C-alpha cells in the first residue's frame, strides 16, 4: 500500500477496526462513479469525504455517491456559514488530496455528519487515502470510526 493508503490502514488499526482492509485497486477509484465500478458496487455505496470550512473550524461530510451535498442543509446543521474547502485546504486539514480523502486519519479529527442514505446499505466503500484506495465497511463501523451524526445531507 502506498503511504497515504498505509496511513489510512494504520488509522483503521489504531481505532480497533484492523479487520477492515484498504485496497489500492488495479482500476481507478478517483470518483464515486469509478470507485463503484472498480468494486462492482452501486454508486450510492461510495462514501465521499467532503471537507468544508466554517468560521471556527473545519467539518467532515460523509456523502453517498448517489447524492449531492446540500450546502444549505450543511450550513444549518453546523449553525454557521460554510464553504467547500479548496484543494489546498483539504491537504492542510486532512493531509490527503481530493479524490482520495478518507473518513479517518486526518491531521485533526473533524466533527462529522453522515448522509442518512448510507444507512440503507449493508456495506459501503470509503476512500483509502488515494485515487485508487478504498476500504469496505458497514455504516455502523463508519459511524464508530468517525463518530459522525446521522443527517439529511442530499439536495434531493
Ligand X SMILES: C[C@H](N)C(=O)NS(=O)(=O)OC[C@H]1O[C@@H](n2cnc3c(N)ncnc32)[C@H](O)[C@@H]1O
Contacting positions for ligand X (CB under 6 A): 29-32, 35, 46, 48-50, 84, 86-87, 98-101, 127, 131
- How far apart are the C-alpha atoms of 135 and 5, rounded to whole Å? 10
- What's the rounded Cα separation, in Å, for the pair 148 and 50? 13
Q: Least distance to ligand X from the beta carbon of 128, Å?
A: 8
Q: Which is nearer to ligand X, 30 or 73 (CB)?
A: 30
Nearer to ligand X (CB atom), residue 16 or residue 154? 154
Nearer to ligand X, 16 or 66 (CB): 66
Residue 49: DSSP 8-state: E
Q: How far apart are CA 3 and CA 22, in angstroms?
A: 12
Minimum distance of ligand X from residue 63's CB (angstroms): 7
Question: For ligand X, which is the closer residue by CB, 100 or 105?
Answer: 100
The residue sitting closest to ligand X, measured at its beta carbon, is 48
Tell the smallest beta-carbon distance from residue 35 to ligand X (Å): 5
The least CB distance from residue 136 to ligand X, in Å, is 12
Query: How far is residue 144's CA from residue 17's CA, in Å, rounded to a whole number?
Result: 9
Q: At what angle do helices 3-15 and 139-146 cross, to 10 degrees?
A: 90
Start-end of H helices in 56-120: 71-78, 87-94
Amino acid at each position: 500500500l502506498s503511504p497515504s493508503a498505509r496511513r489510512v490502514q494504520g488509522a483503521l488499526e489504531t481505532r480497533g477496526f484492523g479487520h477492515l482492509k484498504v485496497v489500492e485497486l488495479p482500476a481507478s477509484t478517483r470518483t464515486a462513479k469509478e470507485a463503484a465500478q472498480a468494486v462492482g458496487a452501486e454508486v450510492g455505496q461510495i462514501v465521499k469525504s467532503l471537507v468544508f470550512v466554517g468560521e471556527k473550524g473545519a467539518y467532515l461530510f460523509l456523502v453517498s455517491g448517489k447524492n449531492r451535498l446540500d450546502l444549505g442543509k450543511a450550513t444549518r446543521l453546523v449553525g454557521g456559514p460554510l464553504r467547500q474547502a479548496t484543494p489546498e485546504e483539504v491537504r492542510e486539514l486532512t493531509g490527503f488530496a481530493i479524490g482520495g480523502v478518507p473518513p479517518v486519519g486526518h491531521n485533526t479529527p473533524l466533527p462529522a455528519y453522515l448522509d442518512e442514505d448510507l444507512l440503507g446499505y449493508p456495506e459501503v466503500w470509503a476512500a483509502g487515502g488515494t485515487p485508487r484506495a478504498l476500504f469496505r465497511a458497514t455504516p455502523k463501523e463508519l459511524l464508530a470510526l468517525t463518530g459522525a451524526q446521522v443527517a439529511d445531507l442530499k439536495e434531493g
